Amino acid sequence: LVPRGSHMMMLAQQWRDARPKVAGLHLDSGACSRQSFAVIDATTAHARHEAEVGGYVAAEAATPALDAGRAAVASLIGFAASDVVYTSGSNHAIDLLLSSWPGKRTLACLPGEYGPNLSAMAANGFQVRALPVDDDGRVLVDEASHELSAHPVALVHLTALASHRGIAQPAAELVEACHNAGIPVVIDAAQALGHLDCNVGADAVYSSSRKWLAGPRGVGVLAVRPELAERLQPRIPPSDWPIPMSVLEKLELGEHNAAARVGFSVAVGEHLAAGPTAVRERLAEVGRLSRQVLAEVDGWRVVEPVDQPTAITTLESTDGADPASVRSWLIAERGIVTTACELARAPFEMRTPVLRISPHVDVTVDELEQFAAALREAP
Amino acid sequence: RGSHMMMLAQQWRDARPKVAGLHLDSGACSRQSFAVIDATTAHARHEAEVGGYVAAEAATPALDAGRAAVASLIGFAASDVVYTSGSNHAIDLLLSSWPGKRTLACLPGEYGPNLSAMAANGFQVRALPVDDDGRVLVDEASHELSAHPVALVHLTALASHRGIAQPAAELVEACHNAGIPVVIDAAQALGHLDCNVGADAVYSSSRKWLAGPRGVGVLAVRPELAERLQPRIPPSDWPIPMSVLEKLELGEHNAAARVGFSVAVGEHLAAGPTAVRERLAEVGRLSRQVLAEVDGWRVVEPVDQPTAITTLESTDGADPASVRSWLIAERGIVTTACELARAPFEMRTPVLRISPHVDVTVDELEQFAAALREAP
Ligand SMILES: *Cc1c(COP(=O)(O)O)cnc(C)c1O
Ligand SMILES: *Cc1c(COP(=O)(O)O)cnc(C)c1O
């Protein structure tokens, strides 16, 4: 632990200048990032085009953008474009899948599982088991492998990057371990897509638009491999469906903001254009730099090991400060945007709430130091 | 008569982008005004300036104003109103939440996907008595409901497939007498019929007569009913302290599109709801008149229906879907082809639907008439 300086990458700056100017300081891209000028205009145009030719004729004519969106998502998760369906977001995604799941509804997940995920699982009548993990919450693959062969489950659900902690989970090696026990794997990549290599052999993946891909709100994607999609049994319409259509078509049924979906196609486009590997290398670096700067703040400890290939850093208060009030103070008084993660976010891992830092590629050591600074004079 | 000069229609046309050709499809997706589009773009910009959720917090006055405009149109309270992805999301939220015996009466012309959601939620469905136009007979229904009660009545006050205006008010007071609550599907009716009729729950879609952004709906539930409801998610035996209506409104959504919608309802109250309805009723009359005389097509709706939905049944076996494509590709005229799946227990034969807003002229209706006769 001899501190290392920031790599200079023109990517940081290109990204800052393709997006509206921040009013204060935004360290919250793990909750809602920032839409590029291009993503904002593309959304606005679809809405204008709806007024000039009609909503549904506009939507039919947007099919090339929407399909490019599915193909971009597909290229990142190593699926096909036609395995990929649109969604309101990741919780819409997990519900559509678990609500559709045929036969014995039993699953194993991390104890650090997202609280609204556990909520969906139980609401769809799943039995949920914890997988073995280390002191950080990172799955033990050897043991998880032994556990799954002896005591199988109908599906393992893996959140490859938790909303509440910047540990990158060994997604790929867990997936072969599960396939080695004949068990499918669903990945919650709400935080992982556009941040971690999500090309790991998974049977289903879902993510949200508004996070690291910097898409509009109200959009997610759900990808299912065709072996698994055909076995699925959607809730709407009912199985006796006079209307005939595939599973993915049923799962994609419903009114949605189509402008936001073309918005989202542009934003995935921008991530491919920037280079997925370069953007991931830089986010790993943002995490490191973030943990270097915050290593010595009195009243706060850094939770993540320093070199986790992630941009998510979490601070547990060492004198029982309430992250929520520190967050409200940092906004009202310093224009700095963070997230306070309550216990409810991962009720089977978190003993104490945490303040979360999730900057995108455009953050500077200067700005991290300014956050460090503001965090010290908090009342 | 019909040469009414109405300034509302002209302001409404000029408040909005220029339609390429002719748009007679406001029952499927209307046209957002420059203000609604601007308000949506501005919320997305603000998210980028101050962060998504701090922007959503700042937007509360506009969001609540939206709930409160909706409340004034249906005679509910703002705090009874909850946002939704649209109307099918609404009905699913309400029926999946329904406690005790799941039994229900509705019209034989019920929305296909409404019946889909009813069946998916383990409801038994009985048909309500109706005349030849599929219009509920309220007295019959009263007797019917006394003799065989039902947990709730689901009235679609205006159908997607036909411009009949259902006697919502009188039906509500009859169901209420039999002690049975009434849910109204008002996706077509909100901004169109008077929807202040004492219903127990009402829902609607942003993109139709209110000309709001797509991806938004409203679901209003009276407090007496709301607190008896048992949402699917989170499960009823969980320890997060939220009200039922907070549970039904949980979830990733396009917040920009909701402030857009609040501007759209705003523009409807500003224009004067009564004046906008009297004018939609007029547009229906002119439509059914100008189209009374068209080889290959009979007008389905009595001329006097207070509605801008007129539907056309082909007399010589044309497929409305192809006529709609032809009309778009070859005349730039937008319409909707209603298939049987839209009302599977009322429709024997599919129909072509026009749903023009307040801004259509006798001229444009004659052009549509003309284009319809030279249709290969
Ligand atoms: C944000 C998030 C979700 C939920 O995404 P929505 O789009 O809000 O439904 C699920 N899992 C993780 C890890 C998240 O960060
Ligand atoms: C369009 C429509 C619906 C469903 O609206 P969505 O917003 O697409 O869910 C329901 N009822 C009627 C009468 C409709 O016209």
Numbering used by the authors:
A (entry chain A): -7 to 371
B (entry chain C): -4 to 371
List sentences quoted exactly from the publication behind this structure:
One of the key steps in the ergothioneine-biosynthesis pathway, the C-S bond cleavage reaction, uses the pyridoxal 5′-phosphate dependent C-S lyase to produce the final product L-ergothioneine. Here, we present the crystallographic structure of the ergothioneine-biosynthesis C-S lyase EgtE from Mycobacterium smegmatis (MsEgtE) represents the first published structure of ergothioneine-biosynthesis C-S lyases in bacteria and shows the effects of active site residues on the enzymatic reaction. EgtE and Egt2 are PLP-dependent C-S lyases in EGT biosynthesis, leading to the conversion from sulfoxide 4 to EGT. Each MsEgtE monomer has 15 α-helices and 11 β-strands and is classified into three domains based on the domain assignments of NcEgt2.
Because of the fast catalytic turnover of the enzyme in the substrate as described in NcEgt2 (32), it is hard to obtain MsEgtE–substrate complex by co-crystallization. A data set to 2.35 Å resolution was collected from a MsEgtE crystal with a short soak in the substrate. We observed an additional oval-shaped electron density in the active site, but it does not match the substrate (sulfoxide 4). Based on the catalytic mechanism of the NcEgt2 enzyme, we found that pyruvate, one of the products in the catalytic reaction, fits well into the electron density map. The complex of MsEgtE-PLP binding to pyruvate is constructed by a homotetramer composed of two homodimers with two PLP cofactors located close to their respective subunits, and pyruvate interacted with the interface of the A/C subunit. In the structure of the MsEgtE-PLP binding pyruvate complex, pyruvate binds in the deep crevice of the active center via extensive interaction with surrounding residues. Specifically, pyruvate forms salt bridges with Arg348 and Arg337, and also binds to Gln183 through a hydrogen bond. Besides, the carboxyl group of pyruvate creates hydrogen bonds with Tyr48′ of another monomer and water molecule. In the α14 of MsEgtE, Arg337 directly interacts with the carboxyl groups of the substrate's cysteine part and forms salt bridges. Tyr48 on α3 of MsEgtE, occupying a spatial position similar to the Phe48 in NcEgt2, participates in pyruvate production with the same function as Arg75 from α3 in NcEgt2.
